[model samples]
Target: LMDQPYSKTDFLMGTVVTLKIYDKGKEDVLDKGFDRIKDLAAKITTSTSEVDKINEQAGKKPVKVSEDVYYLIQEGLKYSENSGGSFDITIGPLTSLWHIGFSDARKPSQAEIDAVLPLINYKDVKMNDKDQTVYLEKEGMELDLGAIAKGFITDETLKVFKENKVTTSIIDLGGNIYVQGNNPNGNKWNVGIQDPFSPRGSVIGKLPESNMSIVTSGIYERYLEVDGKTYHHILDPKTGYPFDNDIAGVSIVSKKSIDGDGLSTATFSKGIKGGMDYIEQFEGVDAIFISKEKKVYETSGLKGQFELTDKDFQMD
Candidate 1:
């Protein structure tokens, strides 16, 4: 017999992570799952985390990280290369300077931003496979997996669920969503695409039900209001400033949560026309782009799958 569904929420990875398991048939599934998430947090975060130790010794020497950290950094590099440096994990120096989404968030002077531009290159991040070590080649260089880590953690949590024989489960790592199996009635899960211009839960459309991961990057999630201008958290590494593109948000849907995570940022960085062209190069990947002008643009893959919910938004 299938066990009842169980759910739990915990704060980790700088956001709320919720794990739900159906037919788990055991009490330790949630315990084990949360442990995995916390483990990843300690290994990836720079806030007094084990990975922070690696960051502290940046430019000083190579720090032998755990397999998990090594794999994540390596994965980050690939995403950086594939996205033509659109999504960079080594963007820590810039992100810290801006401090968006944090209490101390404020605008940085141009000189301040320019000083760290050299440190934001992913090419400077070196990894030793044999020793499972990671090193930042320059002083003050740091690795911020902010754009990609949640999806990686979500995928890991899903692994934990499957290892424990969880047939029906849902993992919500603060907007990095993954649905396992189906609903109680064996129906597909309806996942909403957030409206970037509105408050939370204000979705402009719903994605077709399926066992896949959905990750969205938006300007509305984090920003700073200063002197009548709004600066969002999604910084353009090239400019050391928030991406001032026509896009308000971009959502990537794919089989691997990590791909969705990385591409969400990559696609957003490309704007509308450029983003559409970029996403078209990949197979089995689709994107829903919401423009600041309330225009909705979707890739060919999402033609019939994306359902508009908000009348305020226009389909392109």
Candidate 2:
């Protein structure tokens, strides 16, 4: 178990947001950190939030947003561009229509999905730098940061820990993990990449940990079974449907959790060859791509660091 001196967990960011710090010097700083997380969540989420107001007014007028929200939106747009629209924050229309992972999730008709495809374009998401405002050209358009908000929150929380003179800490925002300093066991942190075909705790490999963020995006995390077919939450903006790639999951290891968050979806959409090629362009970033066929692929940077723990999965 991840035992630490100071730990707190609360429902935030639509998930179980958690913070654990080994610094005993400041007992109350953790509260502030959590508050920061909640504050950001309220502003970024498109559902029943200040962001919802923005979404409601889409196509009518530009909505002024907070600096943090604007900046994150800017970053999200950049990721979308860098990945050739594979990871679009403007995918809100498709996401809400599918409603995967929620109790009300049901497959939408082909016509319904087609109607929203025109609004899912990130290019239509306009922004003003001077006044910090965002606008969507289409009325039904939306700006959902579900793919990158957790990583941004995790990074911001780490800033809070640093400001409070916290050196040894661990932040787990659901699956987005940031391990600072050494592990509680006095060595590298051991993180497992979840096996997509198995239960939650099952792993295909382990990262001999370091001071980095490990974020994994998988089809198994949020999916629905209809008839004999399975549909996952990650939808392609181009097709307005679940990505039909061979990849089951993609885990990214990087210095910033946000990078992992952005890259995980981007790489997963790109498939093995494209994802590996995309990640190899970066210096510090590494990735592990697990296919539905039980094949595991790792980037060159992760050559010696990643250890395959599951014998059933073949390494590519």
Candidate 3:
């Protein structure tokens, strides 16, 4: 279990946001700094929620996006397409149809799924680099940043420590975390990866990091069990169904939270072997995979920085 004492301030950003910063002997400074962090988070959420409104305006003309939201959306397009539509912001339509995490979540029909698929292509979301305006080539197109927007907001919220000149702090946007500056004791800030099925405040590994972002994707998150069958939130673009694989959980750590979020989701869909291979080709990426059969897989280079909490899986 993660016994660490952390100060938390919850705010809305992306979907929902929270900031947990660690600085020893700066309770007063933390209070002040957090005040500023709160304001920044509010602004980001306000803007991000505007993006959500744009998505809610689905089936209508595309809405103009802010520079901050626009760039992330633009960058996300690559992952959406590169991962074979495994990572898509345009999956908003599917999410609404299934509602896995919601009380209303239910099975969607093939026709219902097909009706939204056309409204769910990243390519259809038009972008103008020079003019900085976003449009949907096809009306009814929708964009949902739930996949990665929290990470972007976490990176932005860390600016409070930067502007205040505070050197040691940790911010946790729900599960998406970052350590800005160094630890107060001159050691790297240690972050723990929570076990997918374990109780809250419990971790399976402790990762040492500084100015790095960690994001974990798991089948255990946002799923409802009915008739002994589990339905998860992560969906396959082609099949419009939750990805079927041995991967139950995957955690990715990188210097960039945005990258961490994207890579974690991508790696989870890729499974243990696919995950290992992808990390080999990708730079500055490390991952830990937990299989449904209780086996574990870690990339060759994942050692030294990444550690497994459960010893059930084998890694070479």
Candidate 4:
């Protein structure tokens, strides 16, 4: 009966946060772990949160932020520039206007979207390392780290687990996963890569391994249901609308959760060939790209290592 682990769940970061610690005697450390998650969620997400404080000062003056917030913003900007503004942290103006998944979620008029489009540029975000401050060059610009914050927070919680010498655990931030150590059976954990077209438990493939983070960006997760139509939450800063492309979803497995989180959004926008080539430069990073056509493509590193459990999905 080596099945279950000591588990705790909470609603934070607009997601269902869960931590499962496998080592029996280390149950107490979940306190330290979940505490970090909750702490960061408040620090980064809420209106009264630190990020909002930075937003309040947009175009007015530079707002000083904490080490963690500043570092994360810098990371977001790096990814934003790397992807040529595809995965922007400064998508708050559009996200706040659309407000997907909330009761206020609605489709914006072309004029409304166009107004905020100019404010979504990541280049407009200026950080002073000397003073540790962030300033948005434009008045309406905002930072919505919804794309990368979960991964950063997840990675931070792992630090707590590591400091306690935690041998085994599973961190699930929304659907972003980081499996640590091995299962109680003394084998690497069986981490499933989701079937975007199917139910949550269904998988097209899996990475049964010891430690790694698997983060996926997909259309099915959050739908902004508007008057008999649905729009995804993965917005493109260029169009001020959800990203529509060959990608139905893309799951990236990497050494760090933030990489997977950032790369998933960035890579999905590149489509198949370009996306595959895009991730090949990084060592120990593999991806599963599921196209809108239902074809599955895996990186060269996963050649024979990744296992496919669903036959309905064809390989590319």
Clashes of each: 0, 0, 4, 0
Where's the lowest-lDDT run of ten residues in candidate 4? 198-207
Model 2 misplaced stretches (Cα beyond 4 Å) = 1-4, 184-186
Candidate 4 per-residue lDDT over residues 15-106, each given as its tens digit: 77889997768889888898888788887894488899989989899998999999999999999999998989999999999888777788
On residues 1-316, what C-alpha lDDT tens digit does candidate 2 reach at each position?
Answer: 2355687889775677777878766668789999999899888876577578779989999998888988898899999999999899989989999889889899999999889988888899889998888899989988889989999999999999888888788788776688888876688878888788865557887897768998877798779999999899988999978889889888899999999999888877777888899999988999889888989988998888888988999888
**Clashes, model 2:** 0
Best candidate, TM-score: 1
lDDT of 3 by residue, 1-316 (tens): 1124246554444233444445444445546555654544443342346566566555565566667767777878888887877788777778778878777889888999999887777877777787676676665666667677666666665665666565566776666678776666677878887677664346777888887887777788678787898889888776788888888787787888878887777766776898789877878877777778766667766667667666754443
On the 0 to 100 scale, the lDDT of residue 93 in model 3 is 76
Clashes of 3: 4
lDDT of 1 by residue, 98-177 (tens): 89988889999999998998888889988888888888888898889877888888889888888887778878887668
What TM-score fits each model? 0.95, 0.94, 0.85, 0.94
lDDT, each prediction: 0.84, 0.85, 0.70, 0.86
| Candidate numbers sorted by lDDT from highest down | 4, 2, 1, 3
Task: Tell me how candidate 4 scores on lDDT.
Answer: 0.86
Model 3's alpha-carbon lDDT is 0.70
Instruction: Kindly report the root-mean-square deviation of model 2 from the true structure over all alpha carbons.
Output: 2.0
- Please state the error at residue 109 of candidate 3 in Å: 2.2
Tell me how many residue pairs clash in candidate 1: 0
Candidate 3 residue-wise lDDT at 106: 92
Which of candidates 1 and 3 is the stronger one according to TM-score?
1
